[PDB]
Amino acid sequence: VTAVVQRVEIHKLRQGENLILGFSIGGGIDQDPSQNPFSEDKTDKGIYVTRVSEGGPAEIAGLQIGDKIMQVNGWDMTMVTHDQARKRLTKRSEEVVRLLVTRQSLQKAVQQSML
């Protein structure tokens, strides 16, 4: 890709025997892009963060509502169904979810790098 991507490592919350993300997603190749307020258009099938739990591990790690998730623990998230995205995010054996995300505001980090 050409866009600026940020690595966001989130240690999942724990509740009993469950691990909780502390954030929610929308999108997927099998979903109607219009159900997702963050899809750029009818052709945008990406996975986007739709909610971020206040004070949770996602918020602390730098995750923002509207962020586009490009990768989850090494797995590409650019062209997957919503269910496939959900699975990569909720692996019980993975206490940490390492996301590669992007947002409009990160693009200037490149300007600043140059001066």
With vertex at residue 98, the alpha carbon angle to CA 1 and CA 110, rounded to the nearest 5 degrees, is: 40
Cβ contact 25:36 at 8 Å: no
Indicate the DSSP class of residue 98: E
How many domains does one find in the chain? 1
CB-count burial class (<10 Å; 0-12, 13-18, 19+) for 98: middle
Its domain, for residue 26, covers: 1-115
Residues in the chain: 115
The CATH number given to whatever domain includes residue 11 is 2.30.42.10
Please give the resolution of this entry in Å, rounded to 1 decimal.
Answer: 1.8
The technique is X-ray
Measuring CA to CA, how many Å separate 62 from each of 9, 29, 115?
A: 9, 26, 24
Bridge pairing between strands 47-52 and 13-15: unpaired
Cβ contact 49:63 at 8 Å: yes
How many Å apart are CA 63 and CA 43, to the nearest integer?
24
| First-last CA distance in the chain | 23
